[PDB]
Amino acid sequence: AFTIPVLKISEMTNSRFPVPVDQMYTSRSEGIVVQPQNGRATIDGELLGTTLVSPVSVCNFKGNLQAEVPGQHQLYQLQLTNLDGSPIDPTDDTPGPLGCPDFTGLLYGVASQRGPGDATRAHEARIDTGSDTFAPKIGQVRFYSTSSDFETNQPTHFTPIGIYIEGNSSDFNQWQLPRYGGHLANNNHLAPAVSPLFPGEQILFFRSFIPGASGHTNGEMDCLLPQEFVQHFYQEAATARSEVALLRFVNPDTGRALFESKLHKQGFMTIASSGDHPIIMPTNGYFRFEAWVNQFYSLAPV
Amino acid sequence: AFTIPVLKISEMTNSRFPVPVDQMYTSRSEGIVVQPQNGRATIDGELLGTTLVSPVSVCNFKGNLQAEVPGQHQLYQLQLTNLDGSPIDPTDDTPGPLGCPDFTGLLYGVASQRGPGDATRAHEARIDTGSDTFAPKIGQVRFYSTSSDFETNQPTHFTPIGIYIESDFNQWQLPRYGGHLANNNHLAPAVSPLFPGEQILFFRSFIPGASGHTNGEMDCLLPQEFVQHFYQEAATARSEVALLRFVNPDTGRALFESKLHKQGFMTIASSGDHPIIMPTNGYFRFEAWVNQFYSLAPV
Numbered sequence: 001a002f003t004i005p006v007l008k009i010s011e012m013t014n015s016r017f018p019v020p021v022d023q024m025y026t027s028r029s030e031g032i033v034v035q036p037q038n039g040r041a042t043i044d045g046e047l048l049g050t051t052l053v054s055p056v057s058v059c060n061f062k063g064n065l066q067a068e069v070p071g072q073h074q075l076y077q078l079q080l081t082n083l084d085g086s087p088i089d090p091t092d093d094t095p096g097p098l099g100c101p102d103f104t105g106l107l108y109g110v111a112s113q114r115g116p117g118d119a120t121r122a123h124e125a126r127i128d129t130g131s132d133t134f135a136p137k138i139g140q141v142r143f144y145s146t147s148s149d150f151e152t153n154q155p156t157h158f159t160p161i162g163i164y165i166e167g168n169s170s171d172f173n174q175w176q177l178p179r180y181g182g183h184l185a186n187n188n189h190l191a192p193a194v195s196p197l198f199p200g201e202q203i204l205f206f207r208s209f210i211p212g213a214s215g216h217t218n219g220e221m222d223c224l225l226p227q228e229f230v231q232h233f234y235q236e237a238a239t240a241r242s243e244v245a246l247l248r249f250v251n252p253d254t255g256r257a258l259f260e261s262k263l264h265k266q267g268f269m270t271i272a273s274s275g276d277h278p279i280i281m282p283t284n285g286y287f288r289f290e291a292w293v294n295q296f297y298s299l300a301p302v
Numbered sequence: 303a304f305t306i307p308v309l310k311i312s313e314m315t316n317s318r319f320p321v322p323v324d325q326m327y328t329s330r331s332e333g334i335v336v337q338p339q340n341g342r343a344t345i346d347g348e349l350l351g352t353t354l355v356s357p358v359s360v361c362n363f364k365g366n367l368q369a370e371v372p373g374q375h376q377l378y379q380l381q382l383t384n385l386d387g388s389p390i391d392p393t394d395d396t397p398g399p400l401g402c403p404d405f406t407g408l409l410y411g412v413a414s415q416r417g418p419g420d421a422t423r424a425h426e427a428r429i430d431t432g433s434d435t436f437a438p439k440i441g442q443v444r445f446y447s448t449s450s451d452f453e454t455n456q457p458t459h460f461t462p463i464g465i466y467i468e469s470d471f472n473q474w475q476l477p478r479y480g481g482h483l484a485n486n487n488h489l490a491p492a493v494s495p496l497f498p499g500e501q502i503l504f505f506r507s508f509i510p511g512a513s514g515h516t517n518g519e520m521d522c523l524l525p526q527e528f529v530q531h532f533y534q535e536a537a538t539a540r541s542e543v544a545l546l547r548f549v550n551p552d553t554g555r556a557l558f559e560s561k562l563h564k565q566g567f568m569t570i571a572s573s574g575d576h577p578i579i580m581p582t583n584g585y586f587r588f589e590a591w592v593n594q595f596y597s598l599a600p601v
């Protein structure tokens with residue numbers, strides 16, 4: 001049988017950045033192609049894009065510190081491995097390595113090392129996922145740091161923390177996919193763009209405000225499914241008995257329900273709403289699976 | 303009916319620090335009391351200690367940046383809220399706020415702020431969970447930063463990253479949640495193997511080190527995924543022990559057995575301090591309800 005976990009919004013994890021979900025949010029997404037590559041799974045358990053199941057891995061990188069780049073101080077070259085330690089394989093049926101950021105911007109975090117022996121060191125670092133040299137698909141990623149305290153040829157981890165706003169073209173765009181293969185390459189194996197097809201409906205997003213390290217940004221990061229749903233679908237692999245799972249957002253405090261949403265088989269939710277706005281609800285509220293409906297099932301607004 | 307999620311070791315999350323599990327590990331635990339407060343859940347779904355269900359929240363802090371502390375350069379005083387935004391409530395039946403570190407050491411991470419408006423800033427920061435004034439139970443925590451670029455009275459978040467070795471990291475030494483002037487209460491109980499020839503099975507991560515010599519060993523009793531699953535399923539324990547088999551899907555054969563105790567920890571038949579390295583695809587599955595005197599085959 002098909003099920004979804006009982007979770008308060010505040011208990012959900014963002015599938016595109018390793019922080020909790022802050023609020024439900026809906027938008028028209030006017031003139032935007034919504035094509036995130038993280039937090040993509042079908043309801044019958046097939047992972048898509050660069051989606052992995054670990055809730056703490058998205059936007060992390062691992063690899064060897066190859067060298068400091070010639071000519072540019074405290075810019076360091078990583079030769080990536082996959083997050084699981086295995087070599088990068090550009091022939092994988094993915095756009096890039098699992099967990100790789102699916103947005104362009106200055107990703108701010110910490111690069112740490114262990115080695116030689118148990119000697120360790122860690123410092124702030126930034127990775128520009130929009131730069132020409134950003135090519136995780138073939139394991140080539142550079143990070144900038146304000147420290148020169150990094151050892152060559154030692155295992156290096158990048159732990160993401162937030163976004164750094166310089167105030168120019170490299171600015172955080174959550175819907176702009178990076179060129180996973182680098183400047184000269186076209187993306188492939190992409191999870192498809194999503195949009196609402198039924199009149200009156202909009203996609204329901206799970207939004208987090210990720211930390212900012214500099215500049216002005218609300219750090220808005222919208223995922224299609226909380227990571228817990230991704231994990232659950234993967235784990236259960238339940239048969240999708242129709243194209244749409246009807247879900248109901250219920251308030252355990254009153255015992256009564258607030259709205260319904262359509263969970264599409266391909267892994268995204270829609271609601272009957274119009275306009276760009278937060279969907280604020282009683283904090284103990286959660287979704288419950290009600291029935292198998294089709295893509296023409298008609299929802300009351302809100 | 304009672305189940306365990308199908309997960310490779312490499313897909314598991316540490317329940318005491320927000321990073322993947324690296325290996326299974328077992329220990330004699332000579333001379334130590336094993337009493338972690340995070341990653342504590344009964345197999346029927348009751349969360350204990352400071353355990354929360356969010357897999358990205360443990361060792362995080364949130365609160366108002368109240369002030370730079372007088373007489374102490376670039377040491378800042380937080381007034382905590384709970385990680386879900388709710389106010390800290392010291393009357394809660396917990397040792398401290400959910401997700402609070404359950405070890406003593408120099409916790410290294412990044413303090414970040416948003417405010418006024420959408421202006422942001424973030425810098426490296428350190429929280430000494432062993433210091434006298436570390437009193438998360440009542441919302442009192444300080445962080446040190448090398449930066450002075452922090453605003454007072456703006457929402458502040460501490461994102462943990464690793465451990466800084468110079469208060470040396472002791473994963474089994476519980477902090478004083480109420481600070482040096484109060485004693486801990488409402489602790490999840492210590493655990494130990496009671497049956498001869500058994501040891502606890504731990505899920506071990508090597509957390510990042512920011513400085514100094516450290517392997518960053520962090521041992522939890524259950525991966526966060528098991529905590530989440532038990533909480534969700536809330537299935538009834540039909541006995542004091544759930545017998546599990548760690549099976550290799552590649553061969554269809556069992557590699558070893560483990561006793562999953564009702565109160566939320568695992569033991570195996572083994573002797574000594576060592577990793578338990580197994581075929582990558584291996585995973586635990588429920589076999590049967592047994593008692594606490596069930597005799598396990600070694601390894």
Ligand SMILES: CC(=O)N[C@@H]1[C@@H](O[C@@H]2O[C@@H](C)[C@@H](O)[C@@H](O)[C@@H]2O)[C@H](O[C@@H]2O[C@H](CO)[C@H](O)[C@H](O[C@]3(C(=O)O)C[C@H](O)[C@@H](NC(C)=O)[C@H]([C@H](O)[C@H](O)CO)O3)[C@H]2O)[C@@H](CO)O[C@@H]1O
Binds near residue numbers: 213214215216451
């Ligand atoms: C990490 C770091 O040091 N990076 C700095 C930037 O400072 C960070 O971001 C700030 C927003 C702030 O949170 C700070 O604490 C961080 O360290 C720095 O960004 C400028 O910082 C200053 C200092 O507060 C101002 O916030 C400035 O914003 C404004 C301003 O001066 O009020 C806002 C104003 O709206 C804007 N004008 C217009 C029309 O947009 C002005 C104007 O652009 C500037 O005054 C012209 O210089 O800026 C932040 O832009 C940054 C620039 O100094 O350097 C590093 O990156």
Ligand SMILES: CC(=O)N[C@@H]1[C@@H](O[C@@H]2O[C@@H](C)[C@@H](O)[C@@H](O)[C@@H]2O)[C@H](O[C@@H]2O[C@H](CO)[C@H](O)[C@H](O[C@]3(C(=O)O)C[C@H](O)[C@@H](NC(C)=O)[C@H]([C@H](O)[C@H](O)CO)O3)[C@H]2O)[C@@H](CO)O[C@@H]1O
Binds near residue numbers: 119120
């Ligand atoms: C962030 C920062 O700058 N912190 C430094 C420490 O350096 C960090 O840790 C280091 C291990 C290394 O990863 C470095 O890149 C980091 O920034 C610093 O720690 C000392 O660093 C030095 C310089 O590399 C040495 O590595 C020293 O290690 C040893 C050594 O000298 O080989 C290891 C040795 O095993 C140990 N002695 C024994 C017997 O255990 C000695 C010993 O501590 C000293 O010789 C004293 O008798 O050190 C690191 O200890 C730290 C101290 O300099 O200052 C900041 O913390």
